[PDB]
Amino acid sequence: MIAYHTLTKALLFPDIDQYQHWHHVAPMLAKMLVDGKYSIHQQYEYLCLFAQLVAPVLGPYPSPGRDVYRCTLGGNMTVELSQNFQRSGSTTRIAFEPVRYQASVGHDRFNRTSVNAFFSQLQLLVKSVNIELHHLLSEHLTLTAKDERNLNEEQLTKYLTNFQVKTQYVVALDLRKTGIVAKEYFFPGIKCAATGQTGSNACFGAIRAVDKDGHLDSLCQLIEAHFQQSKIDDAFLCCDLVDPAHTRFKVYIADPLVTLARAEEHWTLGGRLTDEDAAVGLEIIRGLWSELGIIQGPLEPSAMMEKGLLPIMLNYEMKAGQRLPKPKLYMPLTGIPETKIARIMTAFFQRHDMPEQAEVFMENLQAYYEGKNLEEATRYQAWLSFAYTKEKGPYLSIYYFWPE
């Protein structure tokens, strides 16, 4: 937090919206960098980088009732903080939808230009960021001008009632202790509502358009077969902003059937993953889901939103020289008290030889939400992500929602 207190008396923000995003996001970001054992220089580097690079493209500050282009990152903002837990440290990730006020006031209805503006700034400071995949994938996974002309307000109003926002792109800065690596997410929902194609057709067609030598086709077919068998459509796609030949693609699904049997079906790709690591990780998942008491909300996206409940999500990672696709499970935590989550997390950390994470998890969480009663709060920690390898063991991430 010292870096937030110190940079606050040295940074001159040009407008009130950047000022309010700084004081909204930087305190918790500073706490997480301290908790993650980042050096004091990376605390200043990444806070200052957020101020200079990210806050300008977070858009107008969404005061209650303010008529602005809205997003659901962190629940209600255009920015979301998350944390990946290691043994002797943690890694913080900043995710945001680049947006400028023109999107709120009629000059960019689907917010297409702001991600280009952000990348032109990001690439000046993080030279390793390659956006060749943004130019390649944008056509396949976002609404083009043709798609927009063949779109009627009936298909868009139906899509917006199930998924709230008009988001097409999300950028994630992964703050590794050796330097930032960036990832981009493409949401083809509005494109598919205009063209009628399926999410799997858009996401896997985009991968095969970039993967010309077919290095990923065996992984894509295994995943596509499970989606067609288990009757689920691809929701969106992620990629690393690196050289297109060295990137990782991740295909996401969002299942409104929040049951442990449905989660296990996707974790094993309907039985297509039979290795020992999928079997061990499944048993660690089974116990976490059980002890957390993951709430099965109503399937209808109408009533699941008014109950404040989230679906289950998974992604499947794909790289060129990879044998099998690598799953990761996202368990929704909204509706579960924060102290209950912190009790299972502490027990998890000490069971899997992470005693330093177990000692400080509760006090670190309470400091993220100063003066809040974590026994009544149920909408702060929103997602728990799980992946397992024999090398890494089980590794967990928490995705945080902002207070209302």
Curated annotation (Swiss-Prot):
Source species of the chain: Aspergillus fumigatus (Neosartorya fumigata)
Recorded family membership: Belongs to the tryptophan dimethylallyltransferase family.
Name of the protein in question: Cyclic dipeptide prenyltransferase
Effect recorded for A95V: Strongly decreases the enzymatic activity
Known catalytic reactions: harmol + dimethylallyl diphosphate = 6-(3-dimethylallyl)harmol + diphosphate; an N-terminal L-tryptophanyl-L-alpha-aminoacyl-[peptide] + H2O = an N-terminal L-alpha-aminoacyl-[peptide] + L-tryptophan; (R)-benzodiazepinedione + dimethylallyl diphosphate = (2S,3R,11R)-aszonalenin + diphosphate; (S)-benzodiazepinedione + dimethylallyl diphosphate = (2S,3R,11S)-aszonalenin + diphosphate
Annotated consequence of substituting T72A: Decreases the enzymatic activity
Keywords: Aminopeptidase, Hydrolase, Prenyltransferase, Protease, Transferase
Residues bound to substrate: T72, E80, F187
Coiled coil: none
